[PDB]
Copies of this chain bind each other. A is one copy, B any other.
Amino acid sequence: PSDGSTANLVPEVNNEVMALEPVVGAAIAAPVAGQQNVIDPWIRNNFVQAPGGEFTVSPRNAPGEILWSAPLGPDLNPYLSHLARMYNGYAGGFEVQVILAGNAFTAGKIIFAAVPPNFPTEGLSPSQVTMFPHIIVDVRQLEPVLIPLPDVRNNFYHYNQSNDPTIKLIAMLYTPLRANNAGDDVFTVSCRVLTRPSPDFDFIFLVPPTVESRTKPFTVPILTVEEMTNSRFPIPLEKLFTGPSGAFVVQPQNGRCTTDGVLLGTTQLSPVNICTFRGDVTHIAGTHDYTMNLASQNWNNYDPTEEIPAPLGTPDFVGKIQGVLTQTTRGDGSTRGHKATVSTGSVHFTPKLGSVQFTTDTNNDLETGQNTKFTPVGVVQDGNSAHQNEPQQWVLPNYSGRTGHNVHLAPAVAPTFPGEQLLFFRSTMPGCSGYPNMNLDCLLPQEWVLHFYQEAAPAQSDVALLRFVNPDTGRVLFECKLHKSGYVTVAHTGPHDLVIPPNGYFRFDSWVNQFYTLAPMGN
């Protein structure tokens, strides 16, 4: 029967069984629930891959790392996830199926454990995980592992919009992955998690769909790289770039947004106001300089007491940005427009305090009482110093000048996993004079910021696995990790501009954690 297939090289089924008692589902809730609802029986009889149903055991992983985890709830099953947007509550357990059909030349063990509600998961060692109901499975296991997940609880049922905890199922690497195939290959174990609701699972109260926050599902825009725009300067994207970031510090304040839609740093939604200034202008006698007293981005008064590092859309690099000052008089409609340049490294660039300084091409022709808008165009470089050294995109300006220090900054960003580098969305800024460093990398396209902001989908885990697909051929070009903090990572070493089909798009495939091992992508 096995002759020539698997060939007894591999464990067949697991004899271990989790030491959990049976637990009632939604039947107990019937006298106090509003309604008794029904789930399509096909959904109850057929395993389907869970959202966040992929994980990997690779040689980069170390014992103790939680490779997969989830709380009991409708998010364990994509059909139930869509259904849950239509209900107020739930109760009952699941059947989960884990596929671990690793290559016969691999070794290693995984522990699956059920941790009860209100026990902290944060910091558990393998020694400790053994003290919960648990199962230890070999990474070569051929038949899927069946884990029943009961709805241990102290109430009749759960509300979708509450924060009462449920049982968590945990998969942790118990033994490191070892392999003895003779070749110079790496036999990572690709694993899949499938689920179906137990017969005792049921939804509780029918309610208007898509309204409740905690049930909105996460999505990623279908737009192409070329069709999107940089989030750090009002210009389109051009290529995808990965490189090492050990030398410099990646800490932009524009294009900073979390997966569930919280804006960070100086990030705002309009792709046009990303390096604009609006306010009243004042001449400095004897020079071509003007001092601009800042209004808000919508022409309201500017409040320096906001918990923001600077007004929204303030440039997040040191350099000299050339554009045009434009002004209109409210009485006659006279209009004036003059070449102008702002230096963000200048000591008089203090947007947190409310003032910015431009150097213009006039000593007059700019009224004091009129509203003035700086429209940016490009960057410039002082030609007498070293080539390509003036616009330092990864050097933050001092938003309060020499006074004080930068506050309320969005965190810095760095790869966390062995072999991984940041993935940058690269645009080329227009040069206006000299030999400026025109490379501009942002962590998220502005259209993604817009999307995440409007669709406030809660993150099911800390990383969303994305695969980049060529729709003409159907092929995957690379896979990457989109972190909740709003940045992308890929598995590559060295600088590289990605060679991308013009139609390529990002496709969300599974929720994963920071220990997911990405397929090699480079070249």
> Contact at A175–B101, with CB atoms within 8 Å?
yes
A140 proximal to B (CB < 8 A): yes
A518 proximal to B (CB < 8 A): no
Listed by A's residue number, 11 A-B pairs whose Cβ atoms lie within 8 Å are A21-B36, A40-B206, A82-B210, A108-B190, A120-B213, A178-B189, A183-B186, A272-B272, A302-B405, A322-B337, A326-B377
A196 to chain B, nearest CB (A): 10
A346 proximal to B (CB < 8 A): no
Identify which of A61-69, A252-260, A486-494 touches chain B: A61-69
> Contact at A406–B301, with CB atoms within 8 Å?
yes
> Contact at B42–A20, with CB atoms within 8 Å?
no
A140 to chain B: closest residue by CB: B103
A284 proximal to B (CB < 8 A): no
Contacts of A223 in B (CB 8 A): 269, 450, 454
A296 to chain B: closest residue by CB: B226
With beta carbons under 8 angstroms apart, the residue of B45, B180, B332, B519 that contacts A182 is B180
> Contact at A474–B140, with CB atoms within 8 Å?
no
> Contact at A234–B272, with CB atoms within 8 Å?
yes
With beta carbons under 8 angstroms apart, the residue of B228, B375, B430, B467 that contacts A378 is B375
A59 proximal to B (CB < 8 A): yes
> Contact at B182–A431, with CB atoms within 8 Å?
no
A496 proximal to B (CB < 8 A): no
A142 to chain B, nearest CB (A): 6
Whether A334 contacts B179 in the complex (CB less than 8 A), given A49-B126, A86-B82, A205-B116, comes out as no
Whether A337 contacts B206 in the complex (CB less than 8 A), given A236-B297, A271-B229, comes out as no
Whether A433 contacts B336 in the complex (CB less than 8 A), given A24-B31, A88-B118, comes out as yes
A222 proximal to B (CB < 8 A): yes
Known: A89-B154, A105-B182. 6 other contacts (CB 8 A): A19-B46, A21-B35, A66-B474, A180-B181, A228-B270, A336-B432
Contacts of A271 in B (CB 8 A): 229, 271-272
Q: Report the bound CA distance from A270 to B224 in whole Å.
A: 11
Q: Report the bound CA distance from A301 to B108 in whole Å.
A: 46
A405 to chain B, nearest CB (A): 4
A332 to chain B: closest residue by CB: B435
With beta carbons under 8 angstroms apart, the residue of B34, B132, B328 that contacts A116 is B34
A453 to chain B, nearest CB (A): 8
A29 proximal to B (CB < 8 A): yes
A139 to chain B: closest residue by CB: B101
Q: Report the bound CA distance from A498 to B313 in whole Å.
A: 27
Contacts of A36 in B (CB 8 A): 21, 42
A288 proximal to B (CB < 8 A): no
Q: Report the bound CA distance from A102 to B109 in whole Å.
A: 10
> Contact at A23–B19, with CB atoms within 8 Å?
no
